[PDB]
Design an enzyme around this catalytic site. Structure first.
Site, PDB file in Angstrom:
ATOM      1  N   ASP A 185      45.871  -7.061 -19.798  1.00  0.00           N
ATOM      2  CA  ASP A 185      46.173  -8.093 -20.952  1.00  0.00           C
ATOM      3  C   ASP A 185      44.674  -8.525 -21.672  1.00  0.00           C
ATOM      4  OD1 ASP A 185      48.925  -7.842 -20.811  1.00  0.00           O
ATOM      5  OD2 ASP A 185      48.927  -9.526 -19.678  1.00  0.00           O
ATOM      6  N   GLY A 197      52.239 -17.706 -15.896  1.00  0.00           N
ATOM      7  CA  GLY A 197      53.549 -17.853 -16.887  1.00  0.00           C
ATOM      8  C   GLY A 197      53.862 -16.741 -17.541  1.00  0.00           C
ATOM      9  N   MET A 200      52.237 -15.395 -20.076  1.00  0.00           N
ATOM     10  CA  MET A 200      51.184 -15.509 -21.358  1.00  0.00           C
ATOM     11  C   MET A 200      49.822 -15.219 -21.325  1.00  0.00           C
ATOM     12  SD  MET A 200      52.753 -18.987 -22.978  1.00  0.00           S
ATOM     13  CE  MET A 200      52.345 -18.407 -24.495  1.00  0.00           C
ATOM     14  N   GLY A 255      46.952 -16.064 -19.431  1.00  0.00           N
ATOM     15  CA  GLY A 255      46.017 -17.025 -19.348  1.00  0.00           C
ATOM     16  C   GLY A 255      44.785 -16.816 -18.976  1.00  0.00           C
ATOM     17  N   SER A 262      43.584 -13.763 -18.437  1.00  0.00           N
ATOM     18  CA  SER A 262      43.214 -12.804 -19.204  1.00  0.00           C
ATOM     19  C   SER A 262      42.405 -13.317 -20.542  1.00  0.00           C
ATOM     20  CB  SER A 262      44.283 -11.717 -19.824  1.00  0.00           C
ATOM     21  OG  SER A 262      45.024 -11.236 -18.524  1.00  0.00           O
ATOM     22  N   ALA A 263      43.062 -14.264 -21.045  1.00  0.00           N
ATOM     23  CA  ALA A 263      42.531 -15.162 -22.209  1.00  0.00           C
ATOM     24  C   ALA A 263      40.976 -15.687 -21.607  1.00  0.00           C
ATOM     25  CB  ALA A 263      43.143 -16.306 -22.644  1.00  0.00           C
ATOM     26  N   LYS A 295      49.502 -15.142 -25.184  1.00  0.00           N
ATOM     27  CA  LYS A 295      50.246 -14.120 -26.041  1.00  0.00           C
ATOM     28  C   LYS A 295      51.896 -14.283 -25.538  1.00  0.00           C
ATOM     29  CE  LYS A 295      50.867 -11.175 -22.231  1.00  0.00           C
ATOM     30  NZ  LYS A 295      52.228 -11.207 -21.445  1.00  0.00           N
TER      31      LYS A 295
HETATM   32  N1  ATP Z   1      41.440 -18.301 -15.124  1.00  0.00           N
HETATM   33  C1  ATP Z   1      42.528 -18.479 -14.512  1.00  0.00           C
HETATM   34  N2  ATP Z   1      43.593 -18.852 -15.146  1.00  0.00           N
HETATM   35  C2  ATP Z   1      44.861 -18.878 -14.555  1.00  0.00           C
HETATM   36  N3  ATP Z   1      45.120 -18.097 -13.344  1.00  0.00           N
HETATM   37  C3  ATP Z   1      43.935 -17.316 -12.596  1.00  0.00           C
HETATM   38  C4  ATP Z   1      42.814 -17.559 -13.498  1.00  0.00           C
HETATM   39  N4  ATP Z   1      42.093 -16.794 -12.800  1.00  0.00           N
HETATM   40  C5  ATP Z   1      42.648 -16.271 -11.542  1.00  0.00           C
HETATM   41  N5  ATP Z   1      43.942 -16.513 -11.670  1.00  0.00           N
HETATM   42  C6  ATP Z   1      44.900 -16.192 -10.615  1.00  0.00           C
HETATM   43  O1  ATP Z   1      45.677 -15.116 -11.265  1.00  0.00           O
HETATM   44  C7  ATP Z   1      47.016 -15.378 -11.453  1.00  0.00           C
HETATM   45  C8  ATP Z   1      47.672 -16.014 -12.615  1.00  0.00           C
HETATM   46  O2  ATP Z   1      47.065 -15.356 -13.855  1.00  0.00           O
HETATM   47  P1  ATP Z   1      47.651 -15.848 -15.235  1.00  0.00           P
HETATM   48  O3  ATP Z   1      47.666 -17.190 -15.368  1.00  0.00           O
HETATM   49  O4  ATP Z   1      46.537 -14.952 -16.087  1.00  0.00           O
HETATM   50  O5  ATP Z   1      49.094 -14.958 -15.078  1.00  0.00           O
HETATM   51  P2  ATP Z   1      49.985 -14.333 -16.407  1.00  0.00           P
HETATM   52  O6  ATP Z   1      49.189 -15.441 -17.232  1.00  0.00           O
HETATM   53  O7  ATP Z   1      51.288 -14.503 -16.056  1.00  0.00           O
HETATM   54  O8  ATP Z   1      49.039 -13.017 -16.565  1.00  0.00           O
HETATM   55  P3  ATP Z   1      49.823 -11.810 -17.219  1.00  0.00           P
HETATM   56  O9  ATP Z   1      50.921 -12.454 -17.979  1.00  0.00           O
HETATM   57  O10 ATP Z   1      48.719 -11.321 -17.937  1.00  0.00           O
HETATM   58  O11 ATP Z   1      50.330 -10.788 -16.118  1.00  0.00           O
HETATM   59  C9  ATP Z   1      47.246 -16.475 -10.094  1.00  0.00           C
HETATM   60  O12 ATP Z   1      47.462 -15.454  -9.090  1.00  0.00           O
HETATM   61  C10 ATP Z   1      46.000 -17.277 -10.330  1.00  0.00           C
HETATM   62  O13 ATP Z   1      45.495 -17.893  -9.008  1.00  0.00           O
HETATM   63  N1  C5P Z   2      50.876  -1.451 -17.098  1.00  0.00           N
HETATM   64  C1  C5P Z   2      51.190  -2.293 -16.214  1.00  0.00           C
HETATM   65  C2  C5P Z   2      50.353  -3.447 -16.106  1.00  0.00           C
HETATM   66  C3  C5P Z   2      50.464  -4.309 -14.850  1.00  0.00           C
HETATM   67  N2  C5P Z   2      51.012  -3.641 -13.638  1.00  0.00           N
HETATM   68  C4  C5P Z   2      51.130  -4.505 -12.634  1.00  0.00           C
HETATM   69  O1  C5P Z   2      50.529  -5.716 -12.749  1.00  0.00           O
HETATM   70  C5  C5P Z   2      49.360  -5.826 -11.921  1.00  0.00           C
HETATM   71  C6  C5P Z   2      48.504  -6.528 -12.529  1.00  0.00           C
HETATM   72  O2  C5P Z   2      48.042  -5.581 -13.792  1.00  0.00           O
HETATM   73  P1  C5P Z   2      46.521  -6.176 -14.669  1.00  0.00           P
HETATM   74  O3  C5P Z   2      45.304  -6.561 -13.610  1.00  0.00           O
HETATM   75  O4  C5P Z   2      46.104  -5.105 -15.416  1.00  0.00           O
HETATM   76  O5  C5P Z   2      46.984  -7.179 -15.345  1.00  0.00           O
HETATM   77  C7  C5P Z   2      48.876  -4.302 -11.468  1.00  0.00           C
HETATM   78  O6  C5P Z   2      48.536  -4.247 -10.177  1.00  0.00           O
HETATM   79  C8  C5P Z   2      50.279  -3.846 -11.737  1.00  0.00           C
HETATM   80  O7  C5P Z   2      51.125  -4.121 -10.218  1.00  0.00           O
HETATM   81  C9  C5P Z   2      51.714  -2.456 -13.910  1.00  0.00           C
HETATM   82  O8  C5P Z   2      52.223  -2.416 -12.958  1.00  0.00           O
HETATM   83  N3  C5P Z   2      51.824  -1.966 -15.173  1.00  0.00           N
END
Ligand code: ATP
Ligand code: C5P
Ligand code: CL
Length: 304
Positions: free
Chosen positions: A144, A105, A107, A109, A111-112, A17
């Protein structure tokens, strides 16, 4: 048609996303922030192949191949346990994640990946869990996750888990600039809290005009309405992101913004061909790790 689809496996694609709009409010009781966001699902996706096995396992290729944990730290592990507990069975499945969504990043990932597991296991077992319950489970896994189930374009409220679908009456064309490293989401929320302790910086207007642009299918209208209140936090932590944004803009993008908690930068373009052009100029500008083209909206987590 390059997806891994062995006989007896179930393969699910779930999209990355970008937040087209993200207003961040007060820190709640529960430790989360109240959000108003417009989530938008794009063609950069993860592909998750789930099979019955003797024990729970995770393997990863693509983005994070060296890097992503395959033990209890993985959100897909948590999703497999949660879904299995919901249905009164052991989480005895192998999970294979082919990742195009950047790690850490902005996006969503992981959560996907977790959303894909829910959908994949439901189908693999023919468990009959309706969409509303899958949504509840996703909500337990992270803010997410429900959007990753839902896909398209959506107004997220609460923590981001409460979703109302919105109209995006066109194909919108994107370029994503992947950063050299990642950002931890909790640090970025902490940082916005800190920036607001220090000064009173500007807040976004209401989403009304952006939603109207979306419903008109009008990328040029939409571009200057895009905004992300975490962007100031993400650029505070990673100053170099300003160069990336400036470069994509100067390359021809209508608008650039940090995606989510970052550090991925997202660039909205006027056409497919325009994104071809912007992505090329940006990869040669020396400002980011690697570049992608994508389009949205795309479907949520779906059996392939
Ligand atoms: N299946 C996965 N893919 C990527 N990172 C993961 C996964 N499972 C756990 N992680 C951990 O979660 C963190 C990164 O998550 P992700 O790559 O979903 O971050 P994000 O995409 O920035 O998440 P969001 O934008 O929803 O906060 C890292 O600490 C990583 O080690
Ligand atoms: N609405 C949100 C979503 C996430 N967060 C922060 O990001 C962290 C990760 O949230 P998720 O596990 O819901 O992705 C939370 O523990 C919190 O520190 C937040 O503070 N408010
Ligand atoms: Cl849904």
């Amino acid at each position: 048609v390059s997806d891994w689809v062995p006989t007896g496996a179930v393969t699910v694609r779930a999209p990355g996303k970008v937040n087209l709009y993200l207003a961040v409010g007060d820190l709640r009781d529960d430790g989360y922030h109240e959000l108003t966001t417009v989530f938008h699902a794009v063609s950069l996706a993860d592909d998750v192949t789930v099979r019955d096995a003797d024990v729970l396992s995770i393997d990863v290729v693509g983005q994070g191949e060296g890097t992503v944990p395959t033990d209890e730290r993985n959100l897909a592990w948590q999703a497999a346990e949660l879904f299995a507990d919901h249905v009164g069975r052991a989480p005895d499945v192998s999970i294979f994640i082919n990742k195009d969504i950047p790690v850490a990043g902005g996006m969503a990932g992981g959560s996907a990946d977790a959303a894909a597991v829910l959908v994949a296991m439901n189908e693999l077992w023919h468990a009959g869990v309706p969409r509303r319950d899958l949504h509840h489970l996703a909500a337990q896994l992270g803010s997410d996750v429900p959007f990753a189930l839902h896909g398209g374009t959506a107004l997220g409220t609460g923590r981001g888990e409460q979703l109302a679908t919105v109209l995006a009456r066109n194909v919108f064309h994107w370029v994503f600039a992947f950063a050299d490293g990642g950002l931890a989401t909790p640090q970025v929320f902490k940082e916005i809290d800190r920036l607001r302790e220090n000064g009173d910086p500007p807040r976004l207007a209401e989403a009304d005009e952006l939603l109207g642009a979306l419903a008109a299918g009008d990328a040029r209208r939409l571009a200057p309405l895009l905004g992300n209140e975490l962007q100031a936090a993400a650029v505070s932590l990673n100053p170099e992101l300003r160069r990336t944004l400036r470069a994509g803009e100067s390359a021809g993008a209508l608008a650039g913004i940090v995606s989510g908690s970052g550090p991925t930068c997202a660039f909205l373009c006027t056409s497919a061909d325009d994104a071809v052009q912007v992505s090329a100029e940006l990869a040669g500008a020396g400002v980011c790790r690697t570049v992608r083209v994508a389009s949205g909206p795309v479907h949520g987590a779906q059996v392939i």
